[PDB]
Design a protein around this motif. Structure first.
Motif, PDB file in Angstrom:
ATOM      1  N   UNK A  34       0.829  -1.197   0.000  1.00 61.93           N
ATOM      2  CA  UNK A  34       0.000   0.000   0.000  1.00 61.93           C
ATOM      3  C   UNK A  34       0.868   1.253   0.000  1.00 61.93           C
ATOM      4  N   UNK A  36       1.111   5.483   1.453  1.00 67.03           N
ATOM      5  CA  UNK A  36       0.617   6.427   2.442  1.00 67.03           C
ATOM      6  C   UNK A  36       0.843   7.855   1.965  1.00 67.03           C
ATOM      7  N   UNK A  37      -0.230   8.632   1.891  1.00 68.17           N
ATOM      8  CA  UNK A  37      -0.132  10.044   1.532  1.00 68.17           C
ATOM      9  C   UNK A  37      -0.579  10.927   2.697  1.00 68.17           C
ATOM     10  N   UNK A  39      -0.530  10.061   5.765  1.00 66.69           N
ATOM     11  CA  UNK A  39      -1.374   9.212   6.581  1.00 66.69           C
ATOM     12  C   UNK A  39      -2.675   8.890   5.873  1.00 66.69           C
ATOM     13  N   UNK A  40      -2.604   8.670   4.563  1.00 61.82           N
ATOM     14  CA  UNK A  40      -3.775   8.266   3.786  1.00 61.82           C
ATOM     15  C   UNK A  40      -3.443   7.109   2.836  1.00 61.82           C
ATOM     16  N   UNK A  41      -4.348   6.140   2.766  1.00 58.85           N
ATOM     17  CA  UNK A  41      -4.161   4.939   1.968  1.00 58.85           C
ATOM     18  C   UNK A  41      -4.602   5.185   0.537  1.00 58.85           C
ATOM     19  N   UNK A  42      -4.027   4.429  -0.389  1.00 61.42           N
ATOM     20  CA  UNK A  42      -4.260   4.667  -1.804  1.00 61.42           C
ATOM     21  C   UNK A  42      -5.270   3.693  -2.398  1.00 61.42           C
ATOM     22  N   UNK A  43      -4.889   2.424  -2.497  1.00 58.12           N
ATOM     23  CA  UNK A  43      -5.762   1.422  -3.079  1.00 58.12           C
ATOM     24  C   UNK A  43      -5.135   0.044  -3.147  1.00 58.12           C
ATOM     25  N   UNK A  44      -5.987  -0.973  -3.199  1.00 59.33           N
ATOM     26  CA  UNK A  44      -5.534  -2.355  -3.235  1.00 59.33           C
ATOM     27  C   UNK A  44      -5.454  -2.856  -4.665  1.00 59.33           C
ATOM     28  N   UNK A  81       4.879   7.146   1.530  1.00 58.37           N
ATOM     29  CA  UNK A  81       5.620   5.939   1.896  1.00 58.37           C
ATOM     30  C   UNK A  81       4.875   4.688   1.427  1.00 58.37           C
ATOM     31  N   UNK A  83       4.324   1.479   2.472  1.00 54.69           N
ATOM     32  CA  UNK A  83       4.220   0.444   3.480  1.00 54.69           C
ATOM     33  C   UNK A  83       3.393  -0.718   2.981  1.00 54.69           C
ATOM     34  N   UNK A  85       1.238  -4.450   4.125  1.00 57.44           N
ATOM     35  CA  UNK A  85       0.551  -5.138   5.204  1.00 57.44           C
ATOM     36  C   UNK A  85       1.166  -6.532   5.332  1.00 57.44           C
ATOM     37  N   UNK A  86       0.535  -7.402   6.117  1.00 54.55           N
ATOM     38  CA  UNK A  86       0.953  -8.793   6.238  1.00 54.55           C
ATOM     39  C   UNK A  86       2.394  -8.928   6.734  1.00 54.55           C
ATOM     40  N   UNK A  87       2.616  -8.453   7.959  1.00 58.50           N
ATOM     41  CA  UNK A  87       3.891  -8.560   8.670  1.00 58.50           C
ATOM     42  C   UNK A  87       5.003  -7.734   8.037  1.00 58.50           C
ATOM     43  N   UNK A  90       6.808  -0.214   7.278  1.00 66.58           N
ATOM     44  CA  UNK A  90       6.637   0.970   6.446  1.00 66.58           C
ATOM     45  C   UNK A  90       7.906   1.230   5.653  1.00 66.58           C
TER      46      UNK A  90
ATOM     47  N   UNK B  35      -5.778   3.797  10.433  1.00 64.88           N
ATOM     48  CA  UNK B  35      -4.427   4.333  10.353  1.00 64.88           C
ATOM     49  C   UNK B  35      -3.744   4.385  11.711  1.00 64.88           C
ATOM     50  N   UNK B  38       0.156   6.627  10.440  1.00 67.25           N
ATOM     51  CA  UNK B  38       0.376   6.547   9.013  1.00 67.25           C
ATOM     52  C   UNK B  38       0.664   5.120   8.612  1.00 67.25           C
ATOM     53  N   UNK B  45      -1.579 -11.207  10.699  1.00 61.60           N
ATOM     54  CA  UNK B  45      -0.162 -10.933  10.963  1.00 61.60           C
ATOM     55  C   UNK B  45       0.032  -9.941  12.111  1.00 61.60           C
ATOM     56  N   UNK B  76      -6.975   6.699  13.078  1.00 64.40           N
ATOM     57  CA  UNK B  76      -8.084   7.258  12.317  1.00 64.40           C
ATOM     58  C   UNK B  76      -8.675   6.181  11.412  1.00 64.40           C
ATOM     59  N   UNK B  78      -9.968   5.942   8.312  1.00 65.14           N
ATOM     60  CA  UNK B  78     -10.096   6.469   6.969  1.00 65.14           C
ATOM     61  C   UNK B  78     -10.583   5.381   6.019  1.00 65.14           C
ATOM     62  N   UNK B  80     -11.100   3.972   1.846  1.00 62.68           N
ATOM     63  CA  UNK B  80     -10.628   4.095   0.475  1.00 62.68           C
ATOM     64  C   UNK B  80     -11.863   4.310  -0.402  1.00 62.68           C
ATOM     65  N   UNK B  85     -10.514  10.653   5.378  1.00 60.20           N
ATOM     66  CA  UNK B  85      -9.999  10.201   6.664  1.00 60.20           C
ATOM     67  C   UNK B  85     -10.984  10.549   7.772  1.00 60.20           C
TER      68      UNK B  85
END
Ligand SMILES: *[C@@H]1O[C@H](CO)[C@@H](O[C@@H]2O[C@H](CO)[C@@H](O[C@@H]3O[C@H](CO)[C@@H](O)[C@H](O)[C@@H]3O)[C@H](O)[C@H]2NC(C)=O)[C@H](O)[C@H]1NC(C)=O
Ligand SMILES: *[C@@H]1O[C@H](CO)[C@@H](O[C@@H]2O[C@H](CO)[C@@H](O)[C@H](O)[C@H]2NC(C)=O)[C@H](O)[C@H]1NC(C)=O
Lengths: 197, 190
Positions: A34, A36-37, A39-44, A81, A83, A85-87, A90, B35, B38, B45, B76, B78, B80, B85
């Motif tokens: 994923x 981070x913008x 502290x914001x997620x983008x997409x899967x 950034x 980062x 998921x799954x162990x 970032x 979040x 971040x 996991x 937070x 947030x 998609x 957020x």
């Protein structure tokens, strides 16, 4: 021998209306990655829906998940950034500086300024603060007073250079040009104005 | 269109306790994530992490069991898919003092004492008393630790032993917001 990052994203400088890619490759990874913008997620997956000009690209096989931003904007000036998921951990901090050129800069004298008078050239909506250079035909640094004015959004500025002229029977018919450039602009734009007494 | 009816709030949780962060969003068709400083979040996991609530009514509350100092972070909920957020959630994970004792041994034969609370958040307060509170003499001095999150409060007592105080016990209690009633170490004067 767990997952690692072969290359993490770095602080990049991009000009407006340009394409940027952030180098994010993590070997020994089969997991979702994923971004981070601030502290914001983008997409899967590699399809980022509901986002304009955002598409992660690279080799899915080699763990390469590079984010692609086309036609950069002031909004994109942020921290990133990649980062996972799954162990997974970032990935660094990515400060994206989206440089922007000044717009419609001119001298507050009109087409011709007939008249210890003054001139002043004003750069508008540029980041970083665009620099003004004063010269009729050769650089006339003497007199130029550079003063930066911050803007509403606090990201961009509006530098205004007040010139200390003192017109005479000579300067009549003589053009005073004013150029304004910034890191976004290699060769600044210029406005040609006519003096008169 | 889509909104947040209730957003997560700054919550105070004690160690080894359960917490839930209130995040409900009506009129939503998009996936909702959480979040942590971040960082993105049934959370695989990761141990003790499970988002709960009604997906049907739009409720997505985060649940943390057996709280720990590591969990002290900003959150937070947030989402998609064209979603925004959701506020900031400062989770204050309180922790009790560890192995608080008096630097005198079992028995300490113009002398001085000091009871020391170690690794507590917030800085635990030390209270001195033989049989009733003897705040007089007690000098509370807080010592921050490496990670800067927890501290090690040490209260130095200004005693002056005599033929009377012999055989008389000096107990020292230490409490904090995580501990309603502090534990005490009993030392013997001589
Ligand atoms: C018994 O406990 C008391 C309480 O802490 C100790 O008295 C303390 O004595 C020291 C001097 O050795 C004082 O420290 C001084 O602090 C100033 C800053 O204000 C500093 O600039 C000086 O250089 C000096 O270090 C301290 O203030 C004083 N405490 C009180 C409450 O007055 C005493 O030393 C202890 N005795 C033993 C044997 O442990
Ligand atoms: C011409 O431009 C100069 C440059 O700023 C102006 O001079 C300023 O005058 C005020 C006094 O009213 C001072 O407080 C400023 O410090 C001066 N600026 C500098 C750089 O010294 C002058 O006012 C302008 N004249 C106009 C616009 O008619």
């Amino acid at each position: 021998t767990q997952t690692r990052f072969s290359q993490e994203p770095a602080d990049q400088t991009v000009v407006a209306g340009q394409r940027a890619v952030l180098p994010c490759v993590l070997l020994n990874y089969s997991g979702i990655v994923q971004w981070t913008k601030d502290g914001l997620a983008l997409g899967m997956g590699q399809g980022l829906k509901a986002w304009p000009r955002y598409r992660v690209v690279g080799s899915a096989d080699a763990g390469q998940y590079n984010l692609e931003i086309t036609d950069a904007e002031l909004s994109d000036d942020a921290s990133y950034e990649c980062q996972a998921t799954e162990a997974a951990l970032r990935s660094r901090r990515a400060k994206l500086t989206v440089l922007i050129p000044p717009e419609e800069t001119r001298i507050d004298g009109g087409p011709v300024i007939l008249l210890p008078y003054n001139l002043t050239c004003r750069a508008f909506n540029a980041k970083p603060a665009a620099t003004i250079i004063w010269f009729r035909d050769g650089t006339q640094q003497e007199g130029a007073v550079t003063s930066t004015e911050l803007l509403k959004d606090g990201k961009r500025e509006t530098t205004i250079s007040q010139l200390l002229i003192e017109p005479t029977d000579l300067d009549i018919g003589r053009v005073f040009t004013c150029r304004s450039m910034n890191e976004a602009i290699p060769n600044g734009k210029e406005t040609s104005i006519e003096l008169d007494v």
